[PDB]
Amino acid sequence: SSPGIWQLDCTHLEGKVILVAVHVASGYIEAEVIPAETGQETAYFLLKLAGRWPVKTVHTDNGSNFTSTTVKAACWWAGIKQEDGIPYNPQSQGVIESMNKELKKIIGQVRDQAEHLKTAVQMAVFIHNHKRYSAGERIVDIIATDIQ
Amino acid sequence: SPGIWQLDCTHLEGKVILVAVHVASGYIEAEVIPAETGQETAYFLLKLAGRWPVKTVHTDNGSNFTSTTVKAACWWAGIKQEDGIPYNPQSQGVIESMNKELKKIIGQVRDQAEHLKTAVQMAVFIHNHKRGYSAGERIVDIIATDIQ
Numbered sequence: 007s008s009p010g011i012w013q014l015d016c017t018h019l020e021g022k023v024i025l026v027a028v029h030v031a032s033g034y035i036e037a038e039v040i041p042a043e044t045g046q047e048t049a050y051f052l053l054k055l056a057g058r059w060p061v062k063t064v065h066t067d068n069g070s071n072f073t074s075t076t077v078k079a080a081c082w083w084a085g086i087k088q089e090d091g092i093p094y095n096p097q098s099q100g101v102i103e104s105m106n107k108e109l110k111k112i113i114g115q116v117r118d119q120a121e122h123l124k125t126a127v128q129m130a131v132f133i134h135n136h137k138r139y140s141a142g143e144r145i146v147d148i149i150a151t152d153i154q
Numbered sequence: 155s156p157g158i159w160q161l162d163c164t165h166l167e168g169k170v171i172l173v174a175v176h177v178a179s180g181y182i183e184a185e186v187i188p189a190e191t192g193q194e195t196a197y198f199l200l201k202l203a204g205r206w207p208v209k210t211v212h213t214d215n216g217s218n219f220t221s222t223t224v225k226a227a228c229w230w231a232g233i234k235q236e237d238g239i240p241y242n243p244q245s246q247g248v249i250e251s252m253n254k255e256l257k258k259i260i261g262q263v264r265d266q267a268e269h270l271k272t273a274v275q276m277a278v279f280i281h282n283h284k285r286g287y288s289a290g291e292r293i294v295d296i297i298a299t300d301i302q
């Protein structure tokens with residue numbers, strides 16, 4: 007069911023990890039900076055996400071997070087169906103790749119306006135979600151239509 | 155209006171829980187911080203505004219209202235910063251009631267997580283999903299209607 011499908015994505019910058027959740031149908035993103043990708047961090051990030059949007063299905067970003075008992079516990083707790091992120095439609099490798107590139111571009115464009123990477127990442131999330139409908143507008147419409 | 159949010163700060167286990175309430179829906183976002191600073195408040199508002207169309211924020215106290223860092227974040231994110239003075243006195247009480255409710259939910263989940271921040275996100279989840287529509291459903295409908 008389209009409105010509740012999200013994809014996890016992990017990318018690297020400045021020796022740190024940027025963990026991303028993409029709402030597949032809209033292109034809307036949430037992101038956080040962490041020292042490294044662990045089951046613990048991934049579990050906590052999904053809990054945050056699911057308290058904020060109606061997350062039904064998550065395509066995990068790799069097999070370690072798919073396997074993680076802590077990630078499984080969070081998915082059970084929050085009512086999320088955990089799936090693999092295997093691009094059976096191969097335009098997912100590329101589409102995610104393109105987003106990471108775009109995200110990194112925006113980060114570079116704002117980088118000097120903040121001391122800490124996490125701040126620049128949130129600025130980039132803001133710009134990405136507001137860019138013109140915007141991704142922010144699309145996700146709200148998709149989910150509102152699903153409630154109605 | 156669809157873009158009006160209220161900041162709220164409450165205390166638990168020697169820590170601070172920073173809360174943003176979408177006034178029209180009762181939908182909340184929250185984070186745990188060691189103490190309320192302009193810096194933390196600014197970062198929290200940036201995160202919020204990248205995720206929802208935040209037009210106006212009623213700040214929780216005069217220190218955050220005055221903070222140059224909070225003002226910088228509000229300027230950056232296009233947020234009109236206002237005071238949170240309850241000219242309608244059913245705001246003191248309504249916010250107070252939410253903190254009580256939040257703390258109740260936190261206590262109900264507290265033993266399921268080691269760290270307070272996890273329990274707080276569980277409580278956000280439960281609060282936003284509680285049904286008759288949930289706060290999560292209401293915020294999406296309000297904002298979707300505003301776009302259309």
Ligand SMILES: O=C1Nc2ccccc2/C1=C\c1ccc2c(c1C(=O)O)OCO2
Pocket residue numbers: 045046047049050053076079080081083084266267268269270272273
């Ligand atoms: O046992 C649990 N069940 C869960 C269900 C949902 C989300 C986390 C958990 C968790 C534990 C948990 C997971 C990730 C964390 C974390 C904790 C914790 O014990 O505080 O602290 C920060 O990152």
Ligand SMILES: O=C1Nc2ccccc2/C1=C\c1ccc2c(c1C(=O)O)OCO2
Pocket residue numbers: 119120121122123125126192193194196197200223226227228230231
């Ligand atoms: O100069 C700025 N302009 C802003 C506009 C929006 C949000 C933050 C800022 C900020 C600075 C800033 C504010 C709060 C932070 C923070 C930073 C930072 O320098 O990285 O790191 C964590 O918490």
Ligand SMILES: [Cl-]
Pocket residue numbers: 056057058059060282283290291
């Ligand atoms: Cl929700």
